[PDB]
RNA sequence: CGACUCUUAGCGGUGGAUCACUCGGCUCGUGCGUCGAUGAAGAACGCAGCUAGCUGCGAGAAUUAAUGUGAAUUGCAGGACACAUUGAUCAUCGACACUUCGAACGCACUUGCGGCCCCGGGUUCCUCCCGGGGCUACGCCUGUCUGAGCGUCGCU
RNA sequence: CGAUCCUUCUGACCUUUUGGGUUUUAAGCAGGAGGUGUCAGAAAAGUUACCACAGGGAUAACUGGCUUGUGGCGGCCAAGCGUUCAUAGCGACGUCGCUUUUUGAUCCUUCGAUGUCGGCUCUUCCUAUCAUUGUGAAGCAGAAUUCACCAAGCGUUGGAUUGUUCACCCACUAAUAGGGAACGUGAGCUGGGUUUAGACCGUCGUGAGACAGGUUAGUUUUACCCUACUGAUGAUGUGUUGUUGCCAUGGUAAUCCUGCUCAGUACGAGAGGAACCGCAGGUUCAGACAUUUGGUGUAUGUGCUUGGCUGAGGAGCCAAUGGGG
RNA sequence: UUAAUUAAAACAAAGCAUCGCGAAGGCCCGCGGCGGGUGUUGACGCGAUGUGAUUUCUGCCCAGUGCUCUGAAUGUCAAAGUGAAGAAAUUCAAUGAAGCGCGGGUAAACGGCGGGAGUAACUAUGACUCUCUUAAGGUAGCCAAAUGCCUCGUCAUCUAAUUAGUGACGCGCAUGAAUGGAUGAACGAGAUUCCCACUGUCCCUACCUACUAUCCAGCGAAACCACAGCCAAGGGAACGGGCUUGGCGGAAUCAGCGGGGAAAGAAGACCCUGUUGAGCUUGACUCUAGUCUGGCACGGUGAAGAGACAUGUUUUUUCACUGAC
RNA sequence: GGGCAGGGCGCCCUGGAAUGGGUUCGCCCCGAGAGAGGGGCCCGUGCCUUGGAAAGCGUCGCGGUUCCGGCGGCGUCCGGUGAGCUCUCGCUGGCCCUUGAAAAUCCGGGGGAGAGGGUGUAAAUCUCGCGCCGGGCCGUACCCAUAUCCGCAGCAGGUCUCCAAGGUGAACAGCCUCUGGCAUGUUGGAACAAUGUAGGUAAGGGAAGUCGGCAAGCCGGAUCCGUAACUUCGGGAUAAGGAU
RNA sequence: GCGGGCCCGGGUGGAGCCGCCGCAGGUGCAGAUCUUGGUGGUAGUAGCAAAUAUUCAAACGAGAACUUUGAAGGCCGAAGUGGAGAAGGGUUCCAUGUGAACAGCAGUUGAACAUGGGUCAGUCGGUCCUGAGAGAUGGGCGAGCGCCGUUCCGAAGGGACGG
RNA sequence: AUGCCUGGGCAGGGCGAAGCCAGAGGAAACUCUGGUGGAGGUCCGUAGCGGUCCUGACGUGCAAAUCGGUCGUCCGACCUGGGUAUAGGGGCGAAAGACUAAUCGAACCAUCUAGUAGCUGGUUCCCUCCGAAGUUUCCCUCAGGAUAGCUGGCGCUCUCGC
RNA sequence: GACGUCGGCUACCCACCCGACCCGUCUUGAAACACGGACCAAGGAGUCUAACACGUGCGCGAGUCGGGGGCUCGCACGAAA
RNA sequence: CUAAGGCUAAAUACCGGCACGAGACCGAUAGUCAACAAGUACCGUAAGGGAAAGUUGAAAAGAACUUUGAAGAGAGAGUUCA
RNA sequence: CGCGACCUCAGAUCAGACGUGGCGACCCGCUGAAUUUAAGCAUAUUAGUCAGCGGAGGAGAAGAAACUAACCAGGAUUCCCUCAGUAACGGCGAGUGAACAGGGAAGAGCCCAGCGCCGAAUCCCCGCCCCGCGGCGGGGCGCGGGACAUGUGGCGUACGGAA
C-alpha cells in the first residue's frame, strides 16, 4: 500500500517553474523558491554546496554586459570618440 | 523524548478554536454618557444560537445619540428574555431581568450575569450557560462591592462596573447524559480538537512521563509541584488533597 | 575414419587492451586587477534560405555603423559585387541599438487590473473606444511648496 | 601499606616577588601529613524483547568429537530367600566390564549462517528377542510359565487427554519389544511452543523493564545446475540388419491367526485341560484384472427443467460443465 | 489501530471520580518583543489525570516517597548591605529571603495490607486463649481463573478411555476492591469445551474438466560457478568429490525427483569482546531552559510613627498622590 | 417573448363557528376569525403561438461520365396508464450539549437637501417602445485508463465525476438480450504422461484425520404455524422446530 | 641466463625507439564479498498459462494466424470492454509514406519513424469577490540575513456633492 | 497523521420507538385490541471503504505487498477531490514507537569528512646470506601496548700456520 | 653412413612408470563440511612535509652555515648560476 | 607616554575575473566532473546527484557500373601503397 | 481672533543626487560547533577553525605611542629571518604557546574639537555673460534665496601655540 499503490495518486504538483532562476523549484503553498529564494531580495547561496555554487556563477551565463565591460576596460574605457575617417 | 501532548497545544495550528460559524464576541454595550448618567433603551431584535457555546446570544438594537445610526450589540441572553422586548442600560435603569446596570446601584442579594470584573471590559464573569453572580454587600466608601462567583469565591469588585440582571439562559445543560461517542464528537467539533484523550499510562514512555512498563501503572505519584518544567508537569497539578 | 569432448597452430567472429599521436587538463610565475537603478549576475523566449544542438545575436535579433586588412564564405543554390571600387570575408570595435522576468520599480504575478499628461485614428475636446509616447516602487540627503500643534512667545 | 598535581605544618637572620627601597601577601628549597584497597594511583547508575556497527567458533545455545560420573545393560565370589536345597528362579556385603538410544564434563569443527521440538510420510540398518520357526529349564502332571541358545526373515495396532518426547487409560491382538541413520527426515509438509515486534495477568524494580511464571494473534523464499534414485532414447564391438534364445551378474516374498476332527482324549484326586497329521478359511503384504457390484463420467449419449435470445410451433443456443435423473 | 507478518482481550468511547485557575489567572509555545494558542473564551468554562456501559460496592493504612497548608515561636541559609582592627589587600562579627529541617492534611496520590503455639467427652477440624510485631496485617467478594511452582490439586458431570471443558473446596509460591472487585441483557472476522445435521479430514483412494507442465515454430533471460562432481572404511582440523586401502568406472541426452553439494541469500537476528554506539529510565557524574526568592538600577512626592547607634546617621514600618510604568 | 393549463401562498374582502368543524399517508388549522363564496400574488422548466417548417428525420424517384452540400412527391398521426427509474420544483415533518460560511454585486424602502417652465413649453425619466457603436487578454486538439496519468514498462496495482435500455427478478443483486465497444488481454500448432493451480463427483461409516471441523459440505428466498433460558423488559429472533 | 628476464627468425603494423654513465618517481598484482569494461557454463534452459473464443472467403501485399472488408459464433450485458470530463501528459490528435530500431512471435499494423496539417468565444471558463489561510506599510525585536503582528505604541480617506 | 474551508456520494429489504385514530372494559386512575407513524451512532445486504480465514495462488510474481473464494461496515465516530496549517530532538498520532514521499526508537541533501577503530580483509620482481616468539614485569591490562628476552645490520679493539 | 638418412638438451601433441588434494589468509592446527575466488583486459595500496635518533659519504674545521636581503639580465638555456 | 576625535600610499595577501609565459607533471579507466553539442544527456517534488563518449584516409579519391535478393545483405568491377 | 516669527512634526509623481543586488581567490566586523586527540571521558584538544550573517577595494586592515625598555637607551604601521617550540598556559597530561631587542623590504607624515584672535571674513542653490564643456569647472555681473551665531572660514594641536 505504501509503495506501488501509493505511487498511483501523485496527481497534483507542488513545485513550479521559478521566474528568477528558471528551475522548477517555486513552491506554490509557501511562495518560496528554495533554489534562489525568489521572494527574498538576496540570491540564495551556501558555501557547503561548492558544486551548486559553481553551477550558477558569473561565468555560467551569457555575460552580455560583462564581456563588453571587459572589452571597454581593455581598450581604455573611452567614450564619445570615433577613429579617423578615410 | 518527544514533546508531550499539551505542550503542542500552545503552538496551535491544530488546536485553535473553530470560530468561522460563531456569531461574534459576546460583549456588553460600551460605556458612554447615556449609561453613565441616565439609561439607553434597546430592542431585542432576535435570539440566536452561537456554535460552541451553550448559552444563546441575543441581538439588541440601540440608537447612538451622536449620529443618525442604529447600533447592534450581541448580549448574552438572560433567561426569560424574549424578542420584541425593551432593555434599559445605565445607572438609572430599572431593576428588571435583562437590564445591565452598575452593581453599586442594585441592592444586596441581587442575582446578575455577565458581570464586568473591571470597569469597561464589557462583561466577563458568570456568563457560561446558566451561571450567576450574587451581590453580597456594598461599601459606599472606596466605591467597592462584594460578589459571590459561581465557583464560590467572594471577590471585591468596583461599584462602577455593570452587570445584567438574571441568570444566563440555558440552565441544566449538563444534566442530560451524552449517551454516545457521536454526541461528544459533534459537541467538540464546533469548539476545538481536544475530545479524543489518550491516557498517558497507555502512551509510550517517550510521549508522556506516565508511559512505559509491562503493566499499565503510573509508577510515580500523580500529584506534582506546580513549579515544574513543562513536559513533566502532568497529572494532578499542585493537588492539596487528592482523596474522595 | 563417425558424433561429442580436451590441447596446440593458421584464418575468420565479440571485445577495444597495448603503443604512437593531443585545438585538453593540473601546477607554478608575471602584468592588469574592471559589475550594477544611464538597469548587474542569472533565467525565459525568439533571430539563418535550407538550422535540431553548441556558439553568436536581440524585432536593426548568424548581426548595424566606423577603422585596419584586402578577394572571398562555402555543405548546395542564390548571388550582390566590376577586387582601378570605403570594397567580399575576417580582426578591432570608439557610434547606434539592446524582447520578457530578474536589486526589478503603478498594484499583483494571472501575463490580469489600473491612474496623470501628449499625439493619431474616432473626433471637430465629445465624453466613450482603439493605437502610440512619457511618468506612477521603498528608504534617505539638500533645497522648495503646502500644512498641524491647549510647545515657546510679541502686537491687536 | 601509597606516584604526579593540589592543600596543610615545620626550618633557615634561606631566594624571588621583576625600575629601586620597606612591610603584608604570594611564589620557591628541604622534611612530614591529607589518597588513590581496581592498592605503579580514571572523577562514573540501569534497561533495551525497538535496537545498531567492527569482529570471535579465542567464547556460549545444535549436531558430531575424547570420557562414562550419572543413566541402561552384562558377568565374577557367595551370607542368605526359595517348606528340606546357593546357583529352577534370585541374590546382600564386595568386585570386574560393555553402550552412547538419558543427562553430564571439555570447547576440538562451524558466529561473511550447517534452518533451532514435536507430529505426518517414507527407506534402510542394529539386537540388549515382545510374538512366530527349531531347541535346551524348572519349585514343567496338562494348561499356564518365566530362565537360556542359533536366530532380525516376517509382524509390533485403532483411539480419549496433552504441542509435546515422555506419561496414563479404553479395545483388539501372537505381540502391541527396545533403538540408530547430523538426538534420520522443514528448496518434504504443518507451525501446536519454545524464540522478534502488539497485548493481558501475578511476582520483583521508584522507574524504563525482568521472569525454564501462565494466555492470545503473529509471511515457512528458490532447483532449470552437478551427483544419487525412478523411468526413456540411446552407446563401443559382433561386416549390415532381422530371428529365436543362453547367461554372468544384480533385486527377491510371503507372514500370522481362527473354526471342525483328534478330544472333553493324553495328563490330572478333582477343578481344569492339550499336541501331530488332515479339512474349511481368514489378518497383513505382493502381482494382476474388470464378468459381476460400486465410483467417475463433457461420447456434453438420452430425457426433465429455471432466466434470456432466434416472432411463434418445430429445431436450437447462451448462463467458464446452467442445474438435476 | 501497527500502509508491507500481529484487527486483538489493544486504543478510543459515553458514564464515574479527582486537580489547578476569578485574567498582572491555570496549562502551554516562543533566542527575542506592550509576543502568541486555549480565547469570537469566564467555573454548567478551559487546561491535567485515573477508571472505563447497567446493578451492587469502593474496606484498613500518611510508616516510606510525593503533593499541599501556615509559620519571626526558628536550626541551616548565598549575593548584596552594616559594623570591626589593620597602612590596605583582609578576615572576623552581627544581621539574614526562598529552599531544606520543625508541625498538620491528603491513598478514586505512588503504593501496602503478618508469623508462632495451646484448646470442643473417639479421631479430626476448630469456636476460644497466650505471646512478638507493624502505619494498618487483605474487609466485602472471587478463583487451581488469562493470575496456583507443587499440579495431570481433591470431589462430581461430560467419554469406553480426557494433562482438555463445566460445577463446588480453600490451604491463594504470588487473587482482591476506580493500580478498581463481583455480576452482566445485547454484540464481537476475540480464545476455548460438548451435542444435532453435514460432508473425501480420514478409513482409501478413484474418476472427470479448464489452464500449465510435454513436443514443435518464433522470441528468449536470472541466481550460482576454487576445479569439478560414483561409494565403504582409515586418518585428518575430531562427518571427504579429491588423500590412503579397497569396491569399481563406457560417448550425448529427455521427463520427474528432492538424499547429498555440511545447496543459494545477508560480513548470524541469539551469546561474548570492543575501553564502538544509539532509544528509554532514575536515588548515576557534570550541567542547562524554565520556575521561586534575595540584592542593585529604572524608582519619584507628601504625611505621621518606631527601633538602634550616638549625645546627627542608618534601618526604616504604615497611610496617602501620580508624573514614571 | 405573448397567452393558458398545473402547482403553492404564514395574501385580501362578506360573514362569525360547540351539535365543534375543516383536513393529511402522517400532520395540522380555527373568535389573534375555521368551513362557504368573490378575488389577489409567485413559479409556470409544461401546452398554443412568433421563432417554425424555409430547416431536421423516415421513405419513393430523378438531374449529374465526373464536380456536384441539388431537385421534387408524401409522412412526421390519435389515445391510456403505472409505490415504474432519473432530474427538478413545492409543501410537510424528525435530529442536534452538531444549528449547518463570508465577500463582490444588485435592488427596494423613510426623507425632501435641491430642479423645472410658467399656460406651452421645460427639468426628469431606478428608460416605456424602438434606433447607433463597442466588448480587449489567456485555454480551447487528443487520452482521461487492463496502451496517451503515477508505479524503471503497452505493469492483474492506484487515480475525482455526469449520462444509466428490455426480461427475470424486492432490487443500481446475479444471469440473458438492444444502442455502443472488442478480439480474450507481451504468441500459435500437436497430443491430454507424472506433479501441480482452479473447479467438481464419490458406495458404507460420519471428525475415528488434525494442535484445532483447517478446508469443504450442510441451512439459505417467500407464504403460512410456532418460538425457550435469560434480560437493562428495548431484545434474544430469521431463536429452535414444522407444512407449501 | 638458476632466476627476475633478455637477444635473434617469420607475419601484421606504419613513425618514432633504444644501449651505457648518473638523477627522479604516481615504478612490477592472483586474491582485498577490490573499481571500470567485456565475455562464458547455466542455456536455446526457466519462461512468453489472471479476466470463456474463434472460424471461413476475398483484397492489398514478394511475404498473412495477428492488417482491411463480408459472413458466422461469442464476450463487455447500460455501477459496461459505451458516450464526455477534472488533475496529470504535451502533439501522444489527423492524412500520407517506410518497415532501419521498439511493440519480450510476427505484422502490409501502431500511441514507432519521416513528412506535412490541426485548437477560431461578450455569452464555455480564467479574469472579479471572499472562505480556511498567506503576507507588506506603521510599530517592536534582532549582531545580521530577517523575524514578530494584521489593527496591534499610526497625522492610515488625495475621495465626493453643492457654493 | 491531524485541524479548518469549499464541493460530491451512499440500491433494495427486516425490526416498527415517540406521536395520532377507532373499538371494548372502568365509578375513577386508566387499561387492553386493531391500525397509522417511520426514530435508531438499529439488523441482512449492493456501490464505496477496510483486509479475518484458506497461514490458498504467486513468491528472480501481474505487483519492491498483487489475485481468487470466504469476510467487517455500509445514515454516521461514514467515504472522498481541491485549497490550506502544523517541518525533524520537530510535526502529528481514537496511542501501533504508528505516519512524516517504497527509510522512521529520530526524514532527506550538502559540508565538517579521506571523522575514529586496540577489529576484518588486502598489501605487486628475482637470487643470496642470517634468521626468531608466544616468555619477564607494568598498564581499567586480558583480541593491545611499554619493558627485558629471542633476531638482523653496522662496525671497532686485539691473537695468529708468517 | 649418406638424397629421404642425420643432430635439435629446450618448446607442439600423444602414451607409459612413479609422485602428486586449490590458491591467499586467521590459526598450535587448512585440501577442508573455515572464509574471498566464473574468466580476461586496464587501475590498484608503505607516499610527501616537519621534528628527532643512529650509521654512512663529502666540504670546512674551534669553528661551521647560507636562512633572509642586496649587487650582476631584457628569464631561451634561468625562475638557474 | 598623553587615552576616551580623525586622514594617510610603500614593502603585504590573492585556488575568483581579463590576457599571457613555463614545466624532470597525466596522456583518454590517467589529467579538472567535463580533450567530443559537460554541469550536457539523465534521475529525484526539492535542496541536489551527474555520466559514458577522441583517432578511416596524405587527399573522399566515401566503392561508378553489371548481377542475385523486396530489402537488409552479398558476387564481380573500381579508388588508394594500404 | 486673527495675523506674523521660532521649535518640534507630516504630505508630496515637488527640483536635483545617492543606497539596494551579484562575484566573493585575498580582507574587515560578528556568531560559531562536533567528528579527532587525551588509548575511556566531563576541563582541555580539534578551535575564533568548518558552517551561518553583514561590508569594500585592487588590495583590505593597521598606522604615526595614554609604546618598548631599565639600557651610554630605542622611537608610525606592514612583511621576512631570528628570538622560539622560548618565557608562559594546561585533569601542569595530551597538548598549547607569544613578545622585546637585533638584521633586512619599505619608509611620509599629518589634520580637528577645545583654548583664543579676526565686521560669518564661510558654505550651498538659482538667473545672465565669456572660456570650455564624453571623470560640469573658473571668472565677472545679480538689494536673487537658503544654510550658519545651538558656530562656517583663516592662524593654530602637544614636536608647543598665539600676540
Ligand atoms: Zn528560483
Curated annotation (Swiss-Prot), chain A:
It is found in: Cytoplasm. GO terms for cellular component: cytosolic large ribosomal subunit; synapse. Keywords: Acetylation, Cytoplasm, Metal-binding, Phosphoprotein, Ribonucleoprotein, Ribosomal protein, RNA-binding, rRNA-binding, Zinc, Zinc-finger. A zinc finger (C4-type) spans 18-36. The keyword Zinc applies. The modification N6-acetyllysine is found at residue 9. SUPFAM superfamilies: Zn-binding ribosomal proteins. Pfam families: Ribosomal_L37e. One of its GO terms (molecular function) is rRNA binding. Component of the large ribosomal subunit. The ribosome is a large ribonucleoprotein complex responsible for the synthesis of proteins in the cell. Component of the large ribosomal subunit. Belongs to the eukaryotic ribosomal protein eL37 family. This is Large ribosomal subunit protein eL37. The lineage of its organism: Eukaryota, Metazoa, Chordata, Craniata, Vertebrata.
Amino acid at each position: 500500500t505504501k509503495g506501488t499503490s501509493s505511487f498511483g495518486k501523485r496527481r497534483n504538483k507542488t513545485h513550479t517553474l521559478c521566474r528568477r532562476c528558471g528551475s522548477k523549484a517555486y513552491h506554490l503553498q509557501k511562495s518560496t523558491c528554495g533554489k534562489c529564494g525568489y521572494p527574498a531580495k538576496r540570491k540564495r547561496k551556501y558555501n557547503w554546496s561548492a558544486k551548486a555554487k559553481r553551477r550558477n556563477t558569473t561565468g555560467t551565463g551569457r555575460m552580455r554586459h560583462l564581456k563588453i565591460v571587459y572589452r571597454r576596460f581593455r581598450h581604455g574605457f573611452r567614450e564619445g570618440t570615433t577613429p579617423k575617417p578615410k | 523524548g518527544r514533546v508531550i501532548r499539551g505542550q503542542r497545544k500552545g503552538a496551535g495550528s491544530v488546536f485553535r478554536a473553530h470560530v468561522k460559524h460563531r456569531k461574534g464576541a459576546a460583549r456588553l454595550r460600551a460605556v458612554d454618557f447615556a449609561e453613565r448618567h441616565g439609561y439607553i433603551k434597546g430592542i431585542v431584535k432576535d435570539i440566536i444560537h452561537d456554535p460552541g457555546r451553550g448559552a444563546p446570544l441575543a441581538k439588541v438594537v440601540f440608537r447612538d445619540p451622536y449620529r443618525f445610526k442604529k447600533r447592534t450589540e450581541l448580549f448574552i441572553a438572560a433567561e426569560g428574555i424574549h424578542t420584541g422586548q425593551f432593555v434599559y442600560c445605565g445607572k438609572k435603569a430599572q431593576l428588571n431581568i435583562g437590564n445591565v446596570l452598575p452593581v453599586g446601584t442594585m441592592p444586596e442579594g441581587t442575582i446578575v450575569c455577565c458581570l464586568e470584573e473591571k470597569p469597561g471590559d464589557r462583561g466577563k464573569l458568570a456568563r457560561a450557560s446558566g451561571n450567576y453572580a450574587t451581590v453580597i454587600s456594598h461599601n459606599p466608601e472606596t466605591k467597592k462591592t462584594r460578589v459571590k462567583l459561581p465557583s464560590g469565591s467572594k471577590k471585591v469588585i468596583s461599584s462602577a462596573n455593570r452587570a445584567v440582571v438574571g441568570v444566563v439562559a440555558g440552565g441544566g445543560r449538563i444534566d442530560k447524559p451524552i449517551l454516545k461517542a457521536g454526541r461528544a464528537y459533534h459537541k467538540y467539533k464546533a469548539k476545538r480538537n481536544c475530545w479524543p484523550r489518550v491516557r498517558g499510562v497507555a502512551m509510550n514512555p517517550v510521549e508522556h512521563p506516565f508511559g512505559g512498563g509491562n503493566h499499565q501503572h503510573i509508577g510515580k505519584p500523580s500529584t506534582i509541584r506546580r513549579d515544574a518544567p513543562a513536559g513533566r508537569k502532568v497529572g494532578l497539578i499542585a493537588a492539596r488533597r487528592t482523596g474522595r
